[PDB]
Scaffold this active site. Structure first.
Site, PDB file in Angstrom:
ATOM      1  N   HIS A 151      34.742  45.783   8.992  1.00 29.37           N
ATOM      2  CA  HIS A 151      33.586  46.836   8.625  1.00 29.37           C
ATOM      3  C   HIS A 151      34.238  47.830   7.766  1.00 29.37           C
ATOM      4  CE1 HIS A 151      34.821  50.059  11.172  1.00 29.37           C
ATOM      5  NE2 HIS A 151      34.778  49.151  12.475  1.00 29.37           N
ATOM      6  N   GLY A 186      37.909  57.644  12.786  1.00 32.80           N
ATOM      7  CA  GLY A 186      39.217  57.424  12.174  1.00 32.80           C
ATOM      8  C   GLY A 186      40.092  56.554  13.189  1.00 32.80           C
ATOM      9  N   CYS A 192      39.184  53.536  14.375  1.00 28.71           N
ATOM     10  CA  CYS A 192      38.954  51.949  14.148  1.00 28.71           C
ATOM     11  C   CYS A 192      40.182  51.458  13.778  1.00 28.71           C
ATOM     12  CB  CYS A 192      37.986  51.931  13.331  1.00 28.71           C
ATOM     13  SG  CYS A 192      36.173  52.401  13.846  1.00 28.71           S
TER      14      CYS A 192
END
Ligand SMILES: CCS(=O)(=O)N1CCN(c2cc(Cl)cc(CC(=O)Nc3cncc4ccccc34)c2)CC1
Lengths: 296, 306
Positions: free
Chosen positions: A41, A134, A136
């Site tokens: 993503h 932040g 991820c």
């Protein structure tokens, strides 16, 4: 003595954390050998990735920029080939875990590790983590001897505050997808084998108030446990608890009668290992490891 | 979202752990620059443990009596000195993995991460707090002595604890990295006991503000309290007195959530009176006191889930 929610030492994983930036998105990447793994993503992902070139991905390892020389996708993980092999790459494996299994999470922001905590893969495939924007690309792992087994990569937060991610091959744990759409965690259940492991840990630490003279059949235990949204206890679980049963002298089904009594009557103002709830995020292996002192 | 008991990443401390052996005793040491720090009781012969004269035991030792092992490498001891209850072994190699560090002495209520070690090898990391009675509720087995407590703020490791012993209640006692014990404890096997412990009130309030930030308000009430009335009620539940310093420290969390400190104190008083009534706060059925106001601000978002 003492029993804490203990994570594996995170050092071997810290030396693999990098920052990945593409466009306006910044998240964490895992740098192993000459590949940086991160959530896809950050980029129809085949259609979105085909429009990207290697120089669109900015990879930063500490104060050093790594140059991306290739990119490919594997399920929901993006693999960025870099020109430099990570000299800090530990001995590692990618492993997919099952619900009930525990692991440590090294929470990161901007490729910088911020904290380490221990958690379990819930039966509903979510993790009750602690993550902000932040985070991820932060990873879950276990350590066996000197080998790091990477089992989780953070991808998203669900509306109930719980988290969803993939294994390191990009396969989601649970019926989740990596996009902005209506998604919800299913009704969760308690990890029965882990609660029993924690009751054995309490007994090893001198907390025996909940023990009783009774036993139960596996079937009667499961009929009762299904009523309290507890996962069914299998003969495999009973076998796995064998060593703890032999050490404490409490047969697994004898501990089940204690658990049945706790579900039906509560704790009555008492605690077990400093908790007023039945703790289910310690596996039988975690209990043996912490009540024995295994090192890495 | 979410709220976990989170430890600092342990990597910077792992690269400092060494094994120290003196006679039959083996424990952990912390190797920083060219010095290995460890509990001075590594020189005791277990019998010596009731009334050890450390000065007399140390004078009889030479550098080669201390075996220091860093991984699969033996470090050569070139000097030794005792500072309070810590032995400082000068070695012939500076630790190339030495992080930026400081030795800090903490106060009760302060939290820190512990890297539990056995034979100079890290086994696990957990978060804990210095109890008001100066003990820590750790998870330590035999051979864990010399394991350290630390905080990592802005890439600098602040070492605040070194593990020395387990008291009869299963709780743990240790020193700062200058060898000064936390609490009225001695590195002797003479009968010692932890004083009656109390709940860290300022930390419970911090954790209630964390619950509000994460979207939970069920425990709030329309009342406020004076600081004195709060303390009179809190002392009855074995809670530490809340000071004006604690109220000041909770100011930022009060400003973020819109709940005045003394209004949150009124909610805590009610929780102590009523219990949780089958409800939980941040996944806990007990009031959690091992998160400081600083930890809550560090972990939680800067935007409240209204
Ligand atoms: C009868 C008096 S007393 O009971 O109050 N007591 C006073 C303290 N004393 C003592 C002092 C020192 Cl400085 C070192 C040791 C060694 C030690 O505590 N090691 C350990 C440290 N961590 C976890 C342990 C888990 C299990 C086994 C040992 C552990 C013991 C023991 C006697």
């Amino acid at each position: 003595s003492g029993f804490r929610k203990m994570a594996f030492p995170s050092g071997k994983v810290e030396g693999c954390m990098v920052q990945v930036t593409c466009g306006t998105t910044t998240l964490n990447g895992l740098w192993l050998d000459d590949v940086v793994y991160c959530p896809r993503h950050v980029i129809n992902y085949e259609d979105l990735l085909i429009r990207k070139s290697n120089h669109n991905f900015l990879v930063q390892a500490g104060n050093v920029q790594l140059r991306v020389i290739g990119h490919s996708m594997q399920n929901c993980v993006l693999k960025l080939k870099v020109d430099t092999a990570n000299p800090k790459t530990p001995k590692y494996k990618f492993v997919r875990i099952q619900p009930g299994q525990t692991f440590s999470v090294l929470a990161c922001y901007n490729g910088s590790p911020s904290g380490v905590y221990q958690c379990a893969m819930r039966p509903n495939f979510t993790i009750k983590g602690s993550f902000l924007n932040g985070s991820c690309g932060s990873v879950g792992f276990n350590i066996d001897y000197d080998c790091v087994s990477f089992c989780y990569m953070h991808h998203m937060e669900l509306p109930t505050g719980v988290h969803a991610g993939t294994d390191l091959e990009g396969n989601f744990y649970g019926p989740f997808v990596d996009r902005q759409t209506a998604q919800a965690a299913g009704t969760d259940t308690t990890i029965t084998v882990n609660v029993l492991a924690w009751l054995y840990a309490a007994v090893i630490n001198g907390d025996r108030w909940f023990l009783n003279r009774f036993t139960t059949t596996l079937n009667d235990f499961n009929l009762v446990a299904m009523k309290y949204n507890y996962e069914p206890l299998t003969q495999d679980h009973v076998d796995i608890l064998g060593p703890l049963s032999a050490q404490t002298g409490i047969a697994v089904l004898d501990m089940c009668a204690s658990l049945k009594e706790l579900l039906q009557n509560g704790m009555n103002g008492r605690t077990i290992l400093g908790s007023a709830l039945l703790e289910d995020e310690f596996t039988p292996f975690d209990v043996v490891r912490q009540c024995s002192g295994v090192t890495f």
